Amino acid sequence: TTALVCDNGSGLVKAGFAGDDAPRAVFPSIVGRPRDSYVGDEAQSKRGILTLKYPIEHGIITNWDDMEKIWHHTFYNELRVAPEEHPTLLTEAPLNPKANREKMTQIMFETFNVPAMYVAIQAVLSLYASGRTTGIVLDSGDGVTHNVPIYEGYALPHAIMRLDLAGRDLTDYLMKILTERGYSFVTTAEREIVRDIKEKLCYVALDFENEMATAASSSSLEKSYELPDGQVITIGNERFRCPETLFQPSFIGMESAGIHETTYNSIMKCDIDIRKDLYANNVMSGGTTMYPGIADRMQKEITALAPSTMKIKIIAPPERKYSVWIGGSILASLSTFQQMWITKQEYDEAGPSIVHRKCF
Amino acid sequence: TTALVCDNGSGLVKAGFAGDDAPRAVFPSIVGRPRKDSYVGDEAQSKRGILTLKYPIEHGIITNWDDMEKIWHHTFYNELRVAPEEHPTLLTEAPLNPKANREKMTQIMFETFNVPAMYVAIQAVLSLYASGRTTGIVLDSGDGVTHNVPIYEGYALPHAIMRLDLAGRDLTDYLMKILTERGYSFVTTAEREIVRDIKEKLCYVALDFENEMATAASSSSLEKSYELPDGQVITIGNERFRCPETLFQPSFIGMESAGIHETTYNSIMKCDIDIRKDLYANNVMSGGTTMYPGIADRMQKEITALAPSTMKIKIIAPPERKYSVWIGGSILASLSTFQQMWITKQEYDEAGPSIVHRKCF
Ligand SMILES: Nc1ncnc2c1ncn2[C@@H]1O[C@H](COP(=O)(O)OP(=O)(O)OP(=O)(O)O)[C@@H](O)[C@H]1O
Ligand SMILES: Nc1ncnc2c1ncn2[C@@H]1O[C@H](COP(=O)(O)OP(=O)(O)OP(=O)(O)O)[C@@H](O)[C@H]1O
Ligand SMILES: OCCN(CCO)CCO
Ligand SMILES: OCCN(CCO)CCO
Ligand SMILES: [Sr+2]
Ligand SMILES: [Sr+2]
Ligand SMILES: [Sr+2]
Ligand SMILES: [Sr+2]
Ligand SMILES: [Sr+2]
Ligand SMILES: [Sr+2]
Ligand SMILES: [Sr+2]
């Protein structure tokens, strides 16, 4: 028997087979209905004739009807497997309401007739993937950013921090600042171009003020980008100003602490005896941690905030845009895990509330 | 960086690389010295006519440290052919292994073999891991000893461990005895090795011992022949199932002890009432001496007779269970989540051998 791993995010579904090194399928977490339902790439490419909805907001499922459509699409159209044949591992946001875990469980067993399933916390999976069971994860995706401190596979809920700024906000901000430069990025098609610019050319400056000074004095930091129609544009300080928003949320009008401060504050909410282990094991996860320079910059910022004697290590694996998924693949393909699944039998005997006993 | 997994048993060493599906090297845990200074394993055995042979491990516990060092040296340099300084090494240990022994093993690995990192895992827990479980009760029967080890959520329950002081070597000796009663003769090492081969190839556990005896007596339907390298032939009938029947009836070799079904039952019944149901449904067989065809079905029948009438009982006997400890070690040492669990050379330098008690569970 082979397990499936489905990592449902605010912007992207990552899905595949346990044991694989990477997801087989990655697609937009979008359901389109006429202005009877389309999912993913097709929903996107038919936007003109459709109303589009994102069933997951800031990592939490908020539209169960549309979520069922995402899962149906995942099984039948992307992975192309019969769900009744596969134990299925799903992932969940930090601080996911208990009722949501039950609803995921009920839908899996009742709608999709899975023989077995499990729900794991996304940040814990990314930690596992990095080669640890203790550390603090900064997970930053398309819609939300969290700090999750974890001790021996257990997330410490009182110290979890949530920042409602992530990749989609950074894309919107890059569109704004490139428009201020004198370009015009406003439409949905122009948003896809800017997303590509963001993913290809942006970086986190080690010293932001110095970098702004460098950008002002020479073209040394400038990069050309060819637009779909052939026109070549210049991206300058926008390259590092865009992800600087993560450290300075006031750039997009948010009063919030930046990701260095949320990391520090998370650590400080934990018991003093475990803080040392957390500083030494700060793991970055998710697409919005992919910026070159982010690890170097976090190391510097955390050092400035931490006790002078504190050993600080930032771990940013090259594969971290899929580390949640990879952690799920490791867990779901592990021999010992085969006893951890909620079985169809157990669900029939106990109902959806079995999830709280079996997963956690 | 690839880890090494070395499972040291009373009779056999199983050794290889983490991530592999089977040990690369399996050889006798024996050191011979003249009646070259010392010989190990395969070579010691062949030269035994001019050597005194000793087993440095007895009932799973190291009792001769000079000879154990020679076994580890042979494993690293002659069998695996690696430089130990390049490989984190996972070792295994028996139930109730003395703290002093765990310390001395740790000292030897870091100071003599210069390993970069090391870990010691409980053998029965590794076997359970390999079977796909962290809760269950393991019957581990090897060359020198048999244990039941109940395990709950990844931890062995030492208050409920049971031991039976017979295993594979005793079954070989018993088979030799009953084959000698047939007029066959086994005096040389070569001939005694023949008996071991017959045991490993032709023996099985009868579902109902008395019925099977009756069958063997009324027809030739259960007979098998074994051809020796020199032309001689051994024919065997009820000896096929009388030999491993000893596991269920230790009186066969003059022991008063409970048989493996009763030790398994006794072990479960020493555990907390609220976990017994989980143990009954997860009896995992481990070790070379559980390899007998028929053993799972016989255990199912015997346990069913002892347990409450409504108890769900399941016996799990993985096909490569003669190496399940090793395989569980391979799984563990190659697992991402285990990578901070190793004792590092740095931790050893700073803490000394007692570090093993703080790190290894
Ligand atoms: N190389 C890159 N550089 C910068 N950003 C990137 C890169 N690759 C992907 N991203 C961004 O990462 C985001 C998607 O990441 P991820 O799949 O981790 O999010 P998600 O799970 O869909 O969302 P969330 O975790 O917020 O619920 C998108 O905003 C995308 O533009
Ligand atoms: N297929 C088989 N059938 C019966 N017996 C077997 C088979 N394969 C191996 N054996 C026996 O298993 C024994 C070795 O098993 P194992 O390697 O588990 O023991 P060990 O670890 O050396 O000893 P212990 O666990 O007692 O310290 C030997 O007695 C061998 O003859
Ligand atoms: O810290 C190790 C424990 N961990 C094992 C999962 O791989 C979760 C159980 O608590
Ligand atoms: O349920 C047990 C969890 N764990 C043991 C933790 O040390 C097994 C992880 O492979
Ligand atoms: Sr995510
Ligand atoms: Sr795709
Ligand atoms: Sr419905
Ligand atoms: Sr149904
Ligand atoms: Sr053994
Ligand atoms: Sr040395
Ligand atoms: Sr009987």
Please report residues of A whose CB lies closer than 8 A to that of B277: none
Mutate to test the interface with A, among B337, B338, B359 (most CBs of A within 10 A): B337
Residue B203 sits in the same domain as residue B271: no
List the end-to-end C-alpha distance of chain A, in Å, as a whole number. 24
The four Cα atoms B55, B60, B64, B67 give a dihedral, to 10 degrees, of: 60
Q: Would you give the DSSP letter of residue B55? A: -
Residue ending a domain, choose from A220, A240, A256: A256
Partner residues linked to B122 by β-bridges:
B93
Which of A222, A256, A290 is where one domain is finished? A256
Which chain A residues contact residue B133 at CB under 8 A?
336, 338-339
User: Do A41 and A101 share a structural domain?
Assistant: yes
Which of B137, B336, B341, B359 would best serve as a mutation to test chain A binding (most A beta carbons within 10 A)?
B336
Residue with tokens 């098998």: B224
- A284 forms beta bridges with A138
Same domain membership, residue B90 and residue B117: yes
Cross-chain Cβ contact B130/A335 below 8 Å: yes
Alpha-carbon distances, residue A184 vs A174, A176, A193, A222 (angstroms) = 11, 9, 11, 19
Residue with CA closest to ligand 3 atom 4:
A153
**Which residues of A fall below an 8 Å CB-CB distance to B?**
128-134, 153, 327, 330, 334-336, 338-340
* Chain B residues near residue A339 by CB distance under 8 angstroms: 132-135, 282
B12 and B24 in contact (C-beta within 8 Å)? no
- Pick from B135, B331, B337: CB nearest A339: B135
DSSP annotation of B80 reads I
Q: Determination method here?
A: X-ray
Contacts of A233 (CB under 8 A, 6+ apart): A183, A224, A225, A226, A227
Residue ranges around ligand 1 (CB below 6 Å): A 9-12, 59, 141-144, 166-168, 195, 198-199, 286-288, 290-291, 321
Please state, in angstroms and rounded to a whole number, the distance separating the CA atoms of residues B243 and B178. 8
**For atom 2 of ligand 3, which residue has the closest CA?**
A152
For residues B289 and B247, the answer to whether their CB atoms sit within 8 Å is: yes
- Distance CA(B252)–CA(B241), nearest Å, equals 12
Q: Is the dihedral of CA A234, A240, A241, A246 positive or negative?
A: positive
User: Is residue B153 domain-shared with residue B188, that is, in the same domain?
Assistant: no
Cα gap A241→A190, rounded to integer Å: 19
CA distances to B5, B16, B22, B26, B112 from B80, rounded to whole Å, are 10, 7, 13, 10, 17
Whether A251 and A201 share a structural domain:
yes
Q: Note whether A336 contacts B135, CB cutoff 8 Å.
A: no
- Resolution at which this structure was determined, Å: 1.9
Q: Which of A128, A134, A335 sits opposite B336 (nearest CB)?
A: A128
What gap in Å lies between CA A182 and CA A197, rounded to an integer? 16
Q: Are residues B113 and B128 in the same domain?
A: no
Q: Which of B138, B152, B340, B346 to mutate to test the interface with A (most CBs of A within 10 A)?
A: B340
B13 and B113 assigned to the same domain: yes
Contact call for A132 and B335, based on CB within 8 A: no
CATH code, domain with B189 = 3.90.640.10
CATH number at residue B143: 3.30.420.40
A336 to B134: CB separation less than 8 angstroms, yes or no: yes
Q: Are A320 and A284 in contact, with CB atoms under 8 Å apart?
A: yes
CB B209 within 8 Å of CB B245: yes
DSSP state at residue B77: I
φ and ψ of B10, to 5 deg: -65, -40
- What's the token pair of residue A145? 């950013």
The amino acid present at A354, given as its one-letter code, is I
Are A256 and A249 spatial neighbours (Cβ–Cβ below 8 Å)? yes
Considering the domain architecture, whether residues A29 and A130 belong to the same structural domain is answered as no
CB B165 within 8 A of CB B10: no
Compute, in angstroms, the gap from residue A22 CA to the centroid of ligand 6: 13
Calculate how close chain A gets to B164, using CA atoms only, in Å.
27
Closest ligand (CA of A129): 3
Ligand closest to the CA atom of residue A327: 3
The number of folded domains in chain A is 3
Verify that B101 and B4 share a domain, yes or no.
Answer: yes
Torsion sign over Cα B250, B251, B257, B263:
positive
Q: Do B339 and A132 touch (CB under 8 A)?
A: yes
The residue numbers preceding gaps of C to N over 2.5 A in chain B are 35
Residue B243 burial class via C-beta count within 10 angstroms: exposed 0-12, middle 13-18, buried 19 and up: buried
Domain boundary among B214, B240, B257: B257
For residue A128, the chain B residues in CB contact (below 8 A) are: 336-337
Looking at ligand 2, which atom is closest to the CA of residue B57? Answer: 27
In ligand 4, the atom with minimum distance to the C-alpha of A336 is 10
- Of residues B58, B111, B66, B51, the one with CA closest to residue B84: B111
B94: left (phi over 0), alpha (psi -120 to 50) or beta: beta
Tell whether B19 and B119 lie within a shared domain.
yes
In angstroms, the CA A354 to CA A72 distance is 23
Q: Which residues of B touch A330 (CB under 8 A)?
A: 335-337
Same domain, A25 and A82: yes
Atom 8 of ligand 1: nearest residue by CA position: A287
| B-interface mutation test, from A133, A150, A335, A360, most B Cβ less than 10 A away | A335
Distance CA A90, CA A59 (A): 13
Q: Report the residue from B130, B131, B340 with minimal CB separation from A131.
A: B340
Which residues in chain A touch residue B134, judged by CB atoms under 8 angstroms apart? 336, 339-340
In whole angstroms, how far apart are CA A17 and each of A14, A200, B154, B230? Answer: 11, 28, 26, 54
d(CA A292, CA A211) in angstroms, rounded, equals 14
B129/A335 Cβ within 8 A: yes
- List the single residue in A133, A335, A340 with the smallest CB-CB distance to B337: A133
Ligand 3 nearest-atom number relative to CA A134: 1
**Searching chain A, which residue's CA lies closest to the CA of residue B336?**
A131
- Determine the distance separating the centroid of ligand 1 and the alpha carbon of B258, expressed in angstroms: 62
Residue B253 sits in the same domain as residue B198 = yes
Buried b / exposed e over B119-144, threshold 16 CB at 10 Å, is: bbbbbbbbbbbbbbbbbbbbbbbbbb
List the domain range (segments joined by +) for residue B184: 166-257
H/E run at residue A266:
helix A259-269
Closest-CA residue of A relative to B281 is: A339
When computed from its CA atoms, the radius of gyration of chain B, rounded to whole angstroms, is 21
